[PDB]
Design a protein around this motif. Structure first.
Motif, PDB file in Angstrom:
ATOM      1  N   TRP A  26       0.785  -1.215   0.000  1.00  0.00           N
ATOM      2  CA  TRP A  26       0.000   0.000   0.000  1.00  0.00           C
ATOM      3  C   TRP A  26       0.843   1.304   0.000  1.00  0.00           C
ATOM      4  O   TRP A  26       0.594   2.248  -0.776  1.00  0.00           O
ATOM      5  CB  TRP A  26      -1.012  -0.064   1.170  1.00  0.00           C
ATOM      6  CG  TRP A  26      -2.004   1.042   1.140  1.00  0.00           C
ATOM      7  CD1 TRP A  26      -3.237   1.013   0.547  1.00  0.00           C
ATOM      8  CD2 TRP A  26      -1.874   2.342   1.740  1.00  0.00           C
ATOM      9  NE1 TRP A  26      -3.888   2.214   0.743  1.00  0.00           N
ATOM     10  CE2 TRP A  26      -3.070   3.056   1.451  1.00  0.00           C
ATOM     11  CE3 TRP A  26      -0.859   2.989   2.435  1.00  0.00           C
ATOM     12  CZ2 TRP A  26      -3.287   4.353   1.886  1.00  0.00           C
ATOM     13  CZ3 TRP A  26      -1.064   4.306   2.856  1.00  0.00           C
ATOM     14  CH2 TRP A  26      -2.275   4.981   2.564  1.00  0.00           C
ATOM     15  N   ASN A  68      -6.901   3.491   4.641  1.00  0.00           N
ATOM     16  CA  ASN A  68      -6.216   2.547   5.497  1.00  0.00           C
ATOM     17  C   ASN A  68      -6.608   2.732   6.951  1.00  0.00           C
ATOM     18  O   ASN A  68      -7.370   3.676   7.281  1.00  0.00           O
ATOM     19  CB  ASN A  68      -4.740   2.715   5.329  1.00  0.00           C
ATOM     20  CG  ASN A  68      -4.231   3.907   6.042  1.00  0.00           C
ATOM     21  OD1 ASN A  68      -4.979   4.562   6.746  1.00  0.00           O
ATOM     22  ND2 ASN A  68      -2.956   4.164   5.922  1.00  0.00           N
ATOM     23  N   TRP A  78      -9.225   8.060   4.922  1.00  0.00           N
ATOM     24  CA  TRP A  78      -8.840   8.267   3.533  1.00  0.00           C
ATOM     25  C   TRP A  78      -7.548   9.058   3.525  1.00  0.00           C
ATOM     26  O   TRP A  78      -7.219   9.725   4.485  1.00  0.00           O
ATOM     27  CB  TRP A  78      -9.933   9.077   2.800  1.00  0.00           C
ATOM     28  CG  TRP A  78     -11.242   8.305   2.632  1.00  0.00           C
ATOM     29  CD1 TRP A  78     -12.376   8.430   3.381  1.00  0.00           C
ATOM     30  CD2 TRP A  78     -11.522   7.338   1.643  1.00  0.00           C
ATOM     31  NE1 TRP A  78     -13.322   7.591   2.921  1.00  0.00           N
ATOM     32  CE2 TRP A  78     -12.831   6.901   1.850  1.00  0.00           C
ATOM     33  CE3 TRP A  78     -10.775   6.772   0.609  1.00  0.00           C
ATOM     34  CZ2 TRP A  78     -13.431   5.913   1.077  1.00  0.00           C
ATOM     35  CZ3 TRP A  78     -11.386   5.766  -0.204  1.00  0.00           C
ATOM     36  CH2 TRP A  78     -12.692   5.350   0.054  1.00  0.00           C
ATOM     37  N   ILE A  79      -6.818   9.032   2.434  1.00  0.00           N
ATOM     38  CA  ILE A  79      -5.591   9.818   2.390  1.00  0.00           C
ATOM     39  C   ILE A  79      -5.789  11.323   2.363  1.00  0.00           C
ATOM     40  O   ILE A  79      -4.847  12.064   2.543  1.00  0.00           O
ATOM     41  CB  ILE A  79      -4.679   9.392   1.202  1.00  0.00           C
ATOM     42  CG1 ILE A  79      -5.354   9.640  -0.142  1.00  0.00           C
ATOM     43  CG2 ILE A  79      -4.304   7.892   1.299  1.00  0.00           C
ATOM     44  CD1 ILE A  79      -4.325   9.852  -1.229  1.00  0.00           C
ATOM     45  N   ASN A  98      -2.176  -2.142  10.830  1.00  0.00           N
ATOM     46  CA  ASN A  98      -1.569  -2.453   9.515  1.00  0.00           C
ATOM     47  C   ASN A  98      -2.482  -3.066   8.470  1.00  0.00           C
ATOM     48  O   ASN A  98      -2.036  -3.863   7.660  1.00  0.00           O
ATOM     49  CB  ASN A  98      -0.240  -3.238   9.694  1.00  0.00           C
ATOM     50  CG  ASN A  98       0.811  -2.427  10.487  1.00  0.00           C
ATOM     51  OD1 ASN A  98       0.927  -1.178  10.367  1.00  0.00           O
ATOM     52  ND2 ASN A  98       1.574  -3.129  11.311  1.00  0.00           N
ATOM     53  N   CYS A 100      -5.358  -2.177   5.344  1.00  0.00           N
ATOM     54  CA  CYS A 100      -5.564  -1.259   4.189  1.00  0.00           C
ATOM     55  C   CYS A 100      -6.718  -1.824   3.361  1.00  0.00           C
ATOM     56  O   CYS A 100      -7.028  -3.016   3.478  1.00  0.00           O
ATOM     57  CB  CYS A 100      -4.271  -1.140   3.362  1.00  0.00           C
ATOM     58  SG  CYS A 100      -3.043  -0.087   4.170  1.00  0.00           S
ATOM     59  N   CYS A 113      -1.480  -4.295   4.870  1.00  0.00           N
ATOM     60  CA  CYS A 113      -0.881  -3.264   4.027  1.00  0.00           C
ATOM     61  C   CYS A 113       0.422  -3.697   3.318  1.00  0.00           C
ATOM     62  O   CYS A 113       0.746  -3.181   2.238  1.00  0.00           O
ATOM     63  CB  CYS A 113      -0.605  -1.989   4.837  1.00  0.00           C
ATOM     64  SG  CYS A 113      -2.113  -1.270   5.560  1.00  0.00           S
TER      65      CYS A 113
ATOM     66  N   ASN B  26       4.752  11.166   6.483  1.00  0.00           N
ATOM     67  CA  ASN B  26       3.722  10.330   5.836  1.00  0.00           C
ATOM     68  C   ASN B  26       2.464  11.174   5.459  1.00  0.00           C
ATOM     69  O   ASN B  26       1.921  11.043   4.380  1.00  0.00           O
ATOM     70  CB  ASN B  26       3.355   9.100   6.720  1.00  0.00           C
ATOM     71  CG  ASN B  26       2.672   9.489   8.026  1.00  0.00           C
ATOM     72  OD1 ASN B  26       2.837  10.588   8.533  1.00  0.00           O
ATOM     73  ND2 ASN B  26       1.848   8.588   8.554  1.00  0.00           N
ATOM     74  N   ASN B  27       2.066  12.099   6.318  1.00  0.00           N
ATOM     75  CA  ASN B  27       0.916  12.959   6.027  1.00  0.00           C
ATOM     76  C   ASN B  27       1.168  13.949   4.932  1.00  0.00           C
ATOM     77  O   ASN B  27       0.227  14.357   4.233  1.00  0.00           O
ATOM     78  CB  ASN B  27       0.451  13.692   7.294  1.00  0.00           C
ATOM     79  CG  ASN B  27      -0.296  12.778   8.300  1.00  0.00           C
ATOM     80  OD1 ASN B  27      -0.603  11.684   8.032  1.00  0.00           O
ATOM     81  ND2 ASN B  27      -0.650  13.314   9.399  1.00  0.00           N
ATOM     82  N   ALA B  30       0.804  12.113   1.708  1.00  0.00           N
ATOM     83  CA  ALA B  30      -0.648  11.986   1.473  1.00  0.00           C
ATOM     84  C   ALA B  30      -1.252  13.298   1.022  1.00  0.00           C
ATOM     85  O   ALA B  30      -2.130  13.292   0.187  1.00  0.00           O
ATOM     86  CB  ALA B  30      -1.410  11.485   2.740  1.00  0.00           C
TER      87      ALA B  30
END
Ligand SMILES: *[C@@H]1O[C@H](CO)[C@@H](O)[C@H](O)[C@H]1NC(C)=O
Ligand SMILES: *[C@@H]1O[C@H](CO)[C@@H](O)[C@H](O)[C@H]1NC(C)=O
Ligand SMILES: *[C@@H]1O[C@H](CO)[C@@H](O)[C@H](O)[C@H]1NC(C)=O
Ligand SMILES: *[C@@H]1O[C@H](CO)[C@@H](O)[C@H](O)[C@H]1NC(C)=O
Lengths: 128, 124
Positions: A26, A68, A78-79, A98, A100, A113, B26-27, B30
């Motif tokens: 992922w 995830n 959501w991202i 962990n 996803c 993930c 990481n953010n 994203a």
């Protein structure tokens, strides 16, 4: 140029989609989408889920989407930073560390993930 | 009429967005992906120097698209390629949970959990 979506991408309503031909965990799938100046797939609702599924021929293939499990908040996020806000995806499996989200032609599954599957990137023609 | 979206700064053949808020690495990745963009990629010393010229405050650090891969034990770009170069002159440790940031004058390894600003790019 000619069409709304670039070469190799598929238009579906207001999005251009790229279905990968190789596999990744992922986090590498997210990196790939970013590299291609795109997002991992965000699914707005059930209707969008079904239309995206209707592009897929092979019923056995899984694709990562941009969702995830956040362990500190114990829910799907959501991202774009938002919690999953409905049950429109009817996620199958465990909501745990962990994990996803992946989709197939018929289902939506929780997967570790680290699992190596294909992924879907999006570019929005008409963002919210 | 110009080459980049509103709020993005043109530099050579890229449009850059310098965040005003902070995030762990990481953010930040994203965020860029959400904006249909990449975390900053730096091809060599000349693109580093020109990008650094856009940073007018000396303190401030910005995440870029480079971190330490634990499996491979080296610095890797978000496009999949290894750094495989000493052009950036990274200050600090090459170790687990480290990510790369830039200042006006330097390039730093920092813990990926560190909350700093970040830079996204779109190619022209
Ligand atoms: C993030 O994406 C999800 C799925 O499309 C949507 O429900 C949510 O409203 C979005 N959040 C923001 C801030 O746009
Ligand atoms: C979950 O995604 C968020 C980005 O929205 C990121 O902070 C983190 O890397 C992801 N966690 C895992 C275990 O993949
Ligand atoms: C990944 O980006 C870096 C920095 O711009 C560059 O050195 C490398 O060539 C890129 N890899 C590919 C395949 O473009
Ligand atoms: C480093 O970035 C890669 C994406 O290129 C990703 O596999 C991983 O999430 C990142 N690791 C950390 C600790 O941020």
């Amino acid at each position: 140029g000619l069409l709304n979506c670039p070469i190799y991408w598929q238009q579906l309503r207001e999005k251009c989609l790229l279905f990968s031909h190789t596999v990744n965990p992922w986090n590498n799938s997210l990196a790939d989408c970013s590299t291609k100046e795109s997002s991992l797939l965000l699914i707005r609702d059930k209707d969008e889920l079904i239309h995206t599924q209707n592009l897929i021929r092979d019923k056995a293939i899984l694709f990562w989407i941009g969702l995830n499990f956040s362990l500190s908040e114990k829910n799907w996020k959501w991202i774009n930073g938002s919690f999953l806000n409905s049950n429109d995806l009817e996620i199958r499996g465990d909501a745990k560390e962990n994990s996803c989200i992946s989709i197939s032609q018929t289902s939506v599954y929780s997967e570790y993930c680290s699992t190596e599957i294909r992924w879907i990137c999006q570019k929005e023609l008409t963002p919210v």
